[PDB]
Symmetry: D2
C-alpha cells in the first residue's frame, strides 16, 4: 500500500517520506519577533535538512475574554506573511475562521488550516474547498479517529482533494488530553492514506514536549506541527504549550534520527 502525496509546492508531504516539520509560532504578535522565529527555524532546517513551513495565526476567534487582543486582523495579517515569505524562501500556513477569509488567504499562503472546533462546519468546509489550496485538518479532541474519513470526503466532494490530518490528542476526563499513538494508523486507513501529522505543543495544552514528540515520530508520521517562543516563561499565557526556541536544533536533531531511521524500515506485519 502506497501513501498519498499532497505537495505544497516543491515540498512533498506523505506518510512513507521523511517527515515535514510544520514548525512556527502561535499568535502573530510583531515582525521583529516573527521573522526572528523564522530565523532559527529556517536556519536549523537547511542546516539539518528538514522540509519547513512556517506557521502563525493572524487572529484568535477565541481566548478568555472579549476586551482581548484579536490579532493583526484578517487584512493586516496577510501583509505580515507576505514579507517573510520573500525574505526566506519558505511557505506559510495559517488558520481561517470565516468562509470569506478562505479565498483571500488562499492567494498569500501555501497551506491553509482548519480550526479544530470548526472541523465539522460544512458552510466553511464547502467554502475552503473552492481554493483547492493544500488544507490541514486539525482533529478535534472529541472526535474518534475513524470519523476522520467523512471530513476528508465532504472536502473532496466540494472540490479540494489535497488534505492533511493533524492529531492534537483526545479528551481524557475533564481538562486533560492524551495522545492515542494508535490513532495515526487508524487515521491513515479511512483517509485514503492521506498525510498524518502530530501536533505536539497543542497536544500538551514542559520537559515533556520532547519525550512525547519522540513516541509520535517512531510511529511513522508525515511530519510535525510545533510552536516555539523566545521566552516560554513570561509570555507564558494559555492555549497550547510552546517550545523553548533555542532548543530547536537539539530537539529537531532527535526527530531526524527517528523520522529517518524509522521511515527506512522493511515493512513489518505483526498481523500474521
Amino acid at each position: 500500500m502506497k501513501q498519498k502525496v499532497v505537495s505544497i509546492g516543491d515540498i512533498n508531504v506523505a506518510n512513507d517520506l521523511p517527515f515535514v516539520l510544520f514548525g512556527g509560532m502561535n499568535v502573530l504578535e510583531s515582525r521583529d519577533l516573527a521573522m526572528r522565529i523564522c530565523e532559527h527555524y529556517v536556519t536549523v532546517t537547511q542546516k539539518l535538512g528538514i522540509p519547513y513551513v512556517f506557521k502563525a495565526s493572524f487572529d484568535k476567534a477565541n481566548r478568555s475574554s472579549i476586551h482581548s487582543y484579536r490579532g493583526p486582523g484578517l487584512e493586516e495579517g496577510m501583509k505580515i506573511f507576505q514579507e517573510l515569505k520573500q525574505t526566506f524562501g519558505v511557505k506559510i500556513i495559517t488558520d481561517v475562521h470565516e468562509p470569506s477569509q478562505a479565498q483571500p488567504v488562499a492567494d498569500v499562503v501555501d497551506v491553509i488550516q482548519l480550526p479544530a472546533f470548526l472541523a465539522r462546519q460544512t458552510d466553511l468546509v464547502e467554502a475552503m474547498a473552492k481554493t483547492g489550496a493544500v488544507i490541514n485538518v486539525k482533529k478535534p479532541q472529541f472526535v474518534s479517529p475513524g470519523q476522520m474519513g467523512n471530513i476528508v470526503d465532504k472536502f473532496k466532494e466540494g472540490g479540494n482533494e489535497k488534505v492533511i490530518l493533524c492529531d492534537r490528542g483526545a479528551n481524557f476526563g475533564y481538562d486533560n488530553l492524551v495522545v492515542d499513538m494508535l490513532g495515526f494508523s487508524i487515521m491513515k486507513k479511512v483517509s485514503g492514506n492521506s498525510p498524518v501529522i502530530f501536533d505536539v505543543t497543542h497536544a500538551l495544552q514542559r520537559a515533556q514536549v520532547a519525550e512525547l514528540a519522540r513516541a509520535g515520530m517512531a510511529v511513522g508520521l508525515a511530519g510535525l506541527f510545533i510552536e516555539a517562543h523566545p521566552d516560554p516563561e513570561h509570555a507564558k499565557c494559555d492555549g497550547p504549550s510552546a517550545l523553548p526556541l533555542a532548543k530547536l536544533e537539539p530537539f529537531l536533531k532527535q526527530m531526524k534520527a527517528i523520522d529517518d531511521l524509522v521511515k527506512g524500515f522493511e515493512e513489518l506485519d505483526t498481523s500474521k
Copy 2:
C-alpha cells in the same frame, strides 16, 4: 443562596423554580409537521401545567455531506417561526451560527441558542451579546463544567447578562457520551447560579431517554431540553436521538412528579 432568574417573557427560568421544558424538534422540515409537533407539546403542557418554549433549527451548518439539506435558510427559516408563534401563544428558540443571524433572529424569537462547537467563538459571543435577548449556552462535551464560568463572563462583558447553561453530557472515550449528574451543581456555582438545563436527547446521541431524564430532574434543574418526532423509526437519521412524540404526556408526567416533588425539599446539607 438564592437562584438567578432569566425570564424570557412571562416565563421564569430558575434553579429553585418548577422546571421549564424547552421541548421541540430538531431540524425545521415543513409546517404541517412542525406546527403538528407544537400541537401535542402545546396541548400536554397546558393540560399538565408546564412552562413551554418550542425549539427548532432553521439550518444545519454541519451533517455528513455537502450536497445535503442545509435547511429552510436563515431568511425562509424566520418566516416559519413567525406563524406558529401567533398560532399558539408560545415562545420559540433557535440556534445561530454566523454573527449576522444573531440580530435578525433576535427580533423573531424569545430564546437564542449557541451551538456547542461554537461555545468558545468570541467574535460570535460578542456578536450575539448585543441583542441582549435570552441566551442558551450549549455545553461542549469536551469542556469541564467549572470552565463554564468564563463563557458566562465573556457574555456579560459584551453586554447580555441573561444566560442559560445546557448540559449534553461529556466524552467517554471514543464515540460515547456520559452525563455527569454532578456537573449541574458545579455548573451552578461558577455561573452566578444561572439556570441550568439538561439536554437529554442530545446527551443520548432509545428506551433510555426516560430513565436518564429521570435522574437529571431528581437533581434539581431549571428545566429540560427535548426533541420529538412523529415516527422516530424512519426519519431515523443521525445527530441526536428524539422522543416518540406520542409518549410526550406519559413521559412529561414523570418529570413533573420529579421536578415538583424535588423542587420542594427542605434544603439539605450533607456537607456537615
Copy 3:
C-alpha cells in the same frame, strides 16, 4: 418482564420493589461506635419504613501503608457482628478477601460482599460460591456494565444463584469517577434481571452525596449502599466518602419519595 428476587431472609431485594437500603459503616472500629451507627439507622428505618441491612468491614486488605490498621481480624471481626445482630434484629453484610473467610462468615452474616478489585478472582468466586448465601458483587470502575453477565454466570455455575450487582461508578480519566446512570439498565439486562444497587459513598471516593443519590434512585434501583460516620470531619481519612450520620433521616426521607414514587410508574416505552 418481571424482576429477579434474592431474599436475604424476610427481606426481598428486587428491581420493581421498594429499594432496600444496605446502609452501614466502612471499617469496624469499636462497638460503642458501631452499635451506635446501627442505632440511628435501625431507628430511622422502622420510623420511615425501609428494609435495612447493616454493613461494616472487619478488615482492610489495602490502605496506604503496611504498618497500618488491618482491622479487628477475621476471627475477632465475626464476634463483633454477632452481638449487634441479636441486639437489633437486622442482618449484617461484610466483604471477604481470601477463599477461607467465605464459609466462616457465611454462618454469621446474611449478605456476603465481593471486593471490586477481586471481582474477577475465580478461585475466590468458585470459593464464595459454595456458601450459597446471598452475594453482592461490587462492580469495578474499570469494567463495562455488559461485562457483568459473565461474573454472574461463573457464580451460578459454581452453585450460588442468588447474586446482587453494586455500581460504584466508572473511571473518568485519572483519579476520577463518574456514574453512568445508564449502566443500571444495561446491568439488569445481562444479569437475568438481577437486583441492581447503587453505591453512592464509594462512587464519590461532600454536599454532593445527596444530589447524586437522588438521580440514581429516580432510575429505579433495587436499593442503596451507603456509609455514615458520627464526625465526617476528623476521622476524615481516605477511601470512600461517608454521610454525616445525623443527616440520615432527612436524606433517607428524600430517597423514599423517589424509590416509592418511581417504583410505582406505569411502565413506559420510549422505545417506540
Copy 4:
C-alpha cells in the same frame, strides 16, 4: 539525575541503560511449546544482543468460567520452569496470586510479578516483600501514574527495595485502553527513579503491536514485556494479544534501533 538499578543477577534493569526485554509467553501450556517459545527468544536475543528474561504464568486465577483450565498448578508449575532455566541459561519471571506462592516461587525464579488487580493488596504486598527477590509491579488501568509512589513505598517498608514498574495502559471509556506515553516520565519521578517497562501485548488487550511498541521505546524505558505464540490465529483466545513469534527478530531489531539510538542522547531540557 541518575537512574535506579535493580539487577536480577548478571542483568541490570535501569532507565538510562539499554532496554531489558522481559519477553515470553502467557499461560504455561506444555513444554514442547514453552521451551520452543524460549528457543526463538533465547536465540534472537544473543544473536542481536538483548538482555532476556523468559516469562510464563503457571496459573490463571481468572478467565471466563469456573470449569476452565486453571493451569499447571502452583506445584507442577514450578517444576516446569526449573528445567528450561538450566537448559538455556536465562531467568524466569512469573506472577503470584496468594501470599503463600510468594516464598515457594522466590527460590525458583529470578523475577516475581504482581498481578495488576492485586496491585493494592497489602496482605500480599507485605507477603511478597519478605522474599526480597526482584519484583515487577503491573500498573492497573484504573490507577493514575503518580499513585505508583505509594505502592513502591509499602513494599520498601515491608523489606524488599528492588522493584520494577510495568505500564499496560489506561482505561479509555468502556472496554478500551490507551497508553499515556507521558505516564512513564511521571512514573519515574515518584518511584525514586525505579525502572519503568512498557507491557505492549497486555496494553493491546494486531498489526499495531509494532507501531505502539516503537513509540514506547522512543520515550526511554527500562525495557519491554512481550508475549508471543507460534500460531496467534487458532489459540486466539482472550486476555492480552500476542506477537506472531516468527516476527520476533525483525520486530526486536526495530526496538534496538530505538532503545539504543535513544538511550544515547545528550540529555535534553525543553523545560527552559
